Design a protein around this ligand. Sequence first.
Ligand SMILES: NC(=O)c1ccc[n+]([C@@H]2O[C@H](COP(=O)([O-])OP(=O)(O)OC[C@H]3O[C@@H](n4cnc5c(N)ncnc54)[C@H](O)[C@@H]3O)[C@@H](O)[C@H]2O)c1
Ligand SMILES: *c1nc2c(ncn2[C@@H]2O[C@H](COP(=O)(O)O)[C@@H](O)[C@H]2O)c(=O)[nH]1
Ligand SMILES: *c1nc2c(ncn2[C@@H]2O[C@H](COP(=O)(O)O)[C@@H](O)[C@H]2O)c(=O)[nH]1
Ligand SMILES: *c1nc2c(ncn2[C@@H]2O[C@H](COP(=O)(O)O)[C@@H](O)[C@H]2O)c(=O)[nH]1
Ligand SMILES: *c1nc2c(ncn2[C@@H]2O[C@H](COP(=O)(O)O)[C@@H](O)[C@H]2O)c(=O)[nH]1
Ligand SMILES: [K+]
Ligand SMILES: [K+]
Lengths: 362, 362, 73, 73
Amino acid sequence: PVPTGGDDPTKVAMLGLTFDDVLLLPAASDVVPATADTSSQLTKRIRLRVPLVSSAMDTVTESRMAIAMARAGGMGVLHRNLPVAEQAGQVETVKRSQFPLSTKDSDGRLLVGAAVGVGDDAWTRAMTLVDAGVDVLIVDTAHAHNRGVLDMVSRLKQAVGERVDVVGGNVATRAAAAALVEAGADAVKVGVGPGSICTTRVVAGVGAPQITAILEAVAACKPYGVPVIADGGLQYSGDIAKALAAGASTAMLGSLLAGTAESPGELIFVNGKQFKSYRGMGSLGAMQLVPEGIEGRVPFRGPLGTVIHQLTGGLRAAMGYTGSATIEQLQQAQFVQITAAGLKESHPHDITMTVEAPNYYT
Amino acid sequence: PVPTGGDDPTKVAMLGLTFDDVLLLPAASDVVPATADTSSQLTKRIRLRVPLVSSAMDTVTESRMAIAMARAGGMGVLHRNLPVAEQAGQVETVKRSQFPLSTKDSDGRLLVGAAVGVGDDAWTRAMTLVDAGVDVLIVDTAHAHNRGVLDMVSRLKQAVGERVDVVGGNVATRAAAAALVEAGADAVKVGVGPGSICTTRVVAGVGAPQITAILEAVAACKPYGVPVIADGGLQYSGDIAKALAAGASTAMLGSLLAGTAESPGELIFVNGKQFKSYRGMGSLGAMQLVPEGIEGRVPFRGPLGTVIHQLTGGLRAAMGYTGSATIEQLQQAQFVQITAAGLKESHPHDITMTVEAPNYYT
Amino acid sequence: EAVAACKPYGVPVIADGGLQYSGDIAKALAAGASTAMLGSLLAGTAESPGELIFVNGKQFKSYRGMGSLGAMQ
Amino acid sequence: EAVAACKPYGVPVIADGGLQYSGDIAKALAAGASTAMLGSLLAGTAESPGELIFVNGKQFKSYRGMGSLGAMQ
Ligand SMILES: NC(=O)c1ccc[n+]([C@@H]2O[C@H](COP(=O)([O-])OP(=O)(O)OC[C@H]3O[C@@H](n4cnc5c(N)ncnc54)[C@H](O)[C@@H]3O)[C@@H](O)[C@H]2O)c1
Ligand SMILES: *c1nc2c(ncn2[C@@H]2O[C@H](COP(=O)(O)O)[C@@H](O)[C@H]2O)c(=O)[nH]1
Ligand SMILES: *c1nc2c(ncn2[C@@H]2O[C@H](COP(=O)(O)O)[C@@H](O)[C@H]2O)c(=O)[nH]1
Ligand SMILES: *c1nc2c(ncn2[C@@H]2O[C@H](COP(=O)(O)O)[C@@H](O)[C@H]2O)c(=O)[nH]1
Ligand SMILES: *c1nc2c(ncn2[C@@H]2O[C@H](COP(=O)(O)O)[C@@H](O)[C@H]2O)c(=O)[nH]1
Ligand SMILES: [K+]
Ligand SMILES: [K+]
């Protein structure tokens, strides 16, 4: 019999690795961290100076956050939890608005992104957003291997292909990424359940660990040149370095940017400290059922520029350790799989911390 | 495909083991622990009676610590966070100064070592230290597979290779150790991340578990007779025994020696208990940016001699268990891999310890 | 293992014990089981036997195994 | 003193504040008072306004003065 039970060797397909299961192996390096080139292709036509994209969530990205992310070298994606006219107004506000790395189009204006669903109402929203000058559309769905999501992606590529870039929803397998690539998507977003606010892997018991999912999606997408975006489950800059090394071209950040000042919402004072609200788009409050997210609060951090600077410094240090001149070389790095004891050895241990580092906290 | 994902069987190169994942197997023994010989090679020409070295940290080793370590049978390495004239003065102070195991040169003077960086200013500091009477130069870096570190090691060995011994920076792979040996290093230090105060494996996500790294480095250094020093991650004398059995010849100690009276710094009182500062060299305060260390405090221990005696007693017990007359015989002991339950069983369990033992802390 | 022997004869398999979430039910059904039997998930409902218990202002209900000392007496 | 002022004219005196036991009420009535006004002795009953506070397995209720900062705001 099969060692794990039954007579079917393909019942348990594979062992899945996540960010905490692997470490990057140092290699022969001739690269100073300051000279590392952290530019990467977000889509087949858009290249960012910093490969970080803000999450399309109602407590993460709005006009201010989108403008700040575009100025810092990345991009912001406005959420679709607003009326269509309001979303178009936010797109116009971003496009209408020191920062040498800022992302700009052929007209010299900042780049913005918008998220739409699936359906005729979503089609009207997408048409309104495209008419307002949006550059990239995201078909933001929880299960992108559904036939409706693929049909919507094909429709958008057929209609507004010459003017915008269409990014498919979340996938976690090789077959889903291949289907999205065949459907005509310009970029594939990866991750089902690893988000810090998600309960999908608990409520439905469905998902896949992020590192293995990224590897599978890259094996499905790289021959066609389609970029891969790692979405959800990133907590440190080492996580971003690992996600890029596993094959992803861009990383989408949630809770790391929710505690910044540019994020929408009011500051909450609790017990002499500061926080702000963070919740999933599938949470009960956001969808007003069977929710697949939770509501919570993250500690307050400050300006987005400092956070992006620290994350980029960590990524530059990783590139220096691996000897990667560009991201295209960082994607050829190798991993070492570690156990739980190795995981606790990686973090600071046997020490009582008396002052916090800019890039680390418990 | 690969069970962890993708089509490349070499993406996840190996499975790394740390000190907590293995145990030493007992063997036929004719060795009394009190009759074991713990002498081991530091470099190709320097043999220590106690195979322990002190870390080059601004909270661990200064003149007093170097003198105490040399008297106890080991050696000290002065940190390079000091002005060049000040470090040369510390070297002269150590050389200017019951202890049957004390390590001394051919002129009856206590041995000492000093850490240098990479660069032309580092060259000036190294030449000053050599002219001031240092016994070994440690090219102290974080990534020794960089071209600059190898060039610096080659230059030092070409200039003052007949007067001093050159020890290369920290490596974590077989290729890096082979490159350091080819460059002309007298000894190779191993460990990138295991440090109790380090955050390199979190900020950059780069490293390797210590046991696998030591085995890989020994696989490249032993055929050429180059000693290997295990640096970082050691919390018990059993860890020292495991590191020696993996192939290392000496173990450099950090936090284990940072709480003794001979370590630089002042006593601190918190709720009737004694602590003292311990911070990483890549921490924010130490480099005064993207730090790769933290600042904290460790409980006060006392005289260095008692700590060294306890560690050597544990090592002698391990040598007696494995039937190793010498460290060279300990370097051929076998390992058994354990699970998390095995690690829980190795420590005291289902007990409420009421009095602290000299060699174990809960 | 049980489904590997029960499926050829058309005998259904019931997964009993250890289920704490709906994802666990989905995993049990996907492994070959046809139904799931629930314990503590339904022990705190209003329809289960037993009086309510109040601890620190919150509501609880008693739950014990049939092999427990009290239940086997 | 108040009773010395009020008794000849037949005006009753109400003792208000500081009572913690029934003996205190008896002492106040013996001193010349006619009735007693109770504070903390009735602030912990069910009929008193407020919500039960649960701490360390014991029940409390909130009690504050009208001159307190949180009651004058
Ligand atoms: N052993 C470790 O894992 C580790 C990690 C961080 C810091 N440290 C300690 O902190 C101090 C300073 O460390 P440092 O090495 O950054 O000193 P440093 O800034 O003086 O660097 C010296 C040389 O190391 C190499 N180097 C270091 N980090 C590199 C990277 N990320 N990518 C490429 N090359 C790199 C370069 O050749 C550089 O010129 C030392 O005392 C060191 O032991 C150690
Ligand atoms: C699960 N996942 C959810 C929900 N809303 C958004 N998301 C996903 O999480 C990502 C961010 O996760 P972090 O780990 O916090 O960075 C988002 O980009 C989105 O893909 C939800 O309700 N449940
Ligand atoms: C990471 N590692 C660092 C830093 N400064 C020094 N080190 C290394 O750690 C060792 C200490 O190990 P312990 O586990 O504390 O015994 C040192 O000897 C050195 O090699 C730093 O900032 N980050
Ligand atoms: C062990 N198992 C016992 C006992 N009484 C009943 N059971 C089993 O547990 C199931 C419920 O498990 P939950 O995880 O609580 O859902 C029951 O259906 C029964 O099969 C006992 O004393 N010991
Ligand atoms: C002082 N006295 C205050 C305040 N609010 C009310 N009072 C007086 O105290 C009586 C309560 O006495 P207990 O000892 O609690 O029985 C009240 O009846 C009232 O006369 C205040 O803020 N400061
Ligand atoms: K560490
Ligand atoms: K034990």
